[PDB]
Design a protein around this ligand. Structure first.
Ligand SMILES: O=C(O)[C@@H]1CCCC[C@@H]1c1n[nH]c(=S)[nH]1
Ligand SMILES: O=C(O)[C@@H]1CCCC[C@@H]1c1n[nH]c(=S)[nH]1
Length: 358
């Protein structure tokens, strides 16, 4: 890499790893559309396995960007519409609170207070139907945003229904394969387990637990190389040869709602560039990011604005990730770690790096 990228990356990440006691880390910078990789520390402490460009990390909620793009692709295919009622795709959802709740609402966390977490007790499709039927909204549809795995998780599950494919098969065939993300998995195969990093929580080695709607909301594992490729595809969707996927990426970066200075897309969240770093850094803290906030509808939604800071934080019990890019500048970053450390520390590191290279 050029010495400039090398120096800002190392001057930013070394202190971060030290301060946050991160066991292992991988970073990709996309600069003028080209990837540069960096690795530190351990994928497995006990077995002394280093982090490499082939190490798989749990993306956690960064998975929602894939779910948003898969959904966008389904729209482009004419299989679903964001304006469709939820009940169109799940007829057994007959409780009257679901009247007026559309796939847009589910995708953008504005259904009216669907919970952050699907309860642990909810396993089967039966359990799930019962859970959503009994769910009582706090607000009317399209009035407040409350970030929720049970919202976009349901979107993902319903969005692939017309295709006839499982969510995994839909994602593999329609997103991972076309984009050559050949080391990106919802379920890590035995052949790839050698590369699967351990997560670390209070010093214990942990992997993500199975849960309802896990694949759709937080279930993707990937390498720094594939994630750089994911950023490149979202930076430059017009280079993608599959028409519906190209279109779906653009729909995921459309601005559907505004709260404060952030805009909600499908998975992705966006701010106008130039951004105020205090807004993204402080905004990434869960005191704001998980808070219930009123939303203003963008009527109709704004197509993907090139002059945007487009990003997503993501965590599991043992992992902490961040992706951010600025289409206007052919510039982006992926930060993958096997500890869940505070979001603002991630966004601060990212902004220092990208601001320096912009
Ligand atoms: O990925 C995130 O950051 C989410 C936000 C908080 C609750 C649900 C998710 C979560 N992932 N890992 C843990 S712990 N929680
Ligand atoms: O347990 C949590 O805090 C989270 C539950 C929702 C997102 C995924 C996280 C997770 N599950 N198992 C491991 S490790 N992390």
């Amino acid at each position: 890499a050029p010495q400039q990228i090398n120096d800002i990356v190392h001057r930013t990440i070394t202190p971060l790893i030290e301060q946050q006691k991160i066991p292992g880390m991988a970073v990709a910078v996309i600069y003028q559309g080209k990837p540069y990789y960096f690795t530190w520390g351990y994928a497995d402490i006990a077995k002394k396995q280093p982090v490499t460009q082939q190490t798989l990390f749990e993306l956690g909620s960064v998975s929602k960007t894939f779910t948003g793009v898969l959904g966008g692709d389904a729209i482009a295919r004419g299989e679903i519409k964001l304006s469709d009622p939820t009940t169109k795709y799940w007829p057994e959802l007959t409780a009257k609170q679901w009247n007026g709740i559309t796939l847009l609402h589910l995708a953008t966390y504005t259904a009216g207070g669907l919970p952050l977490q699907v309860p642990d007790e909810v396993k089967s499709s039966s359990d799930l139907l019962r859970f959503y039927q009994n769910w009582q909204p706090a607000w009317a549809p399209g009035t407040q945003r409350l970030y929720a795995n049970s919202s976009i998780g349901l979107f993902g599950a319903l969005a692939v229904k017309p295709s006839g494919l499982s969510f995994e098969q839909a994602m593999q065939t329609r997103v991972f394969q076309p984009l050559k993300l050949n080391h990106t998995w919802i379920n890590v195969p035995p052949a790839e387990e050698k590369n699967y990093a351990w997560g670390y929580r209070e010093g214990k080695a942990v992997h993500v637990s199975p849960g309802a709607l896990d694949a759709e909301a937080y279930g993707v594992k990937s390498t720094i190389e594939d994630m750089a490729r994911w950023v490149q595809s979202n930076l430059k969707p017009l280079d993608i040869n599959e028409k519906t996927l190209q279109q779906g990426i653009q729909l995921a970066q459309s601005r559907y709602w505004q709260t404060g200075d952030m805009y909600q897309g499908l998975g992705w969240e966006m701010l106008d560039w130039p951004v105020n770093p205090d807004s993204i850094i402080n905004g990434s803290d869960n005191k704001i990011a998980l808070a219930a906030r009123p939303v203003k509808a963008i009527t109709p939604p704004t197509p993907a604005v090139r002059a945007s800071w487009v990003h997503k934080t993501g965590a599991t019990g043992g992992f902490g990730s961040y992706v951010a890019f600025i289409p206007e500048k052919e510039l982006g970053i992926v930060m993958l770690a096997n500890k869940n450390y505070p979001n603002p520390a991630r966004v601060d590191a990212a902004w220092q790096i990208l601001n320096a290279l912009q």
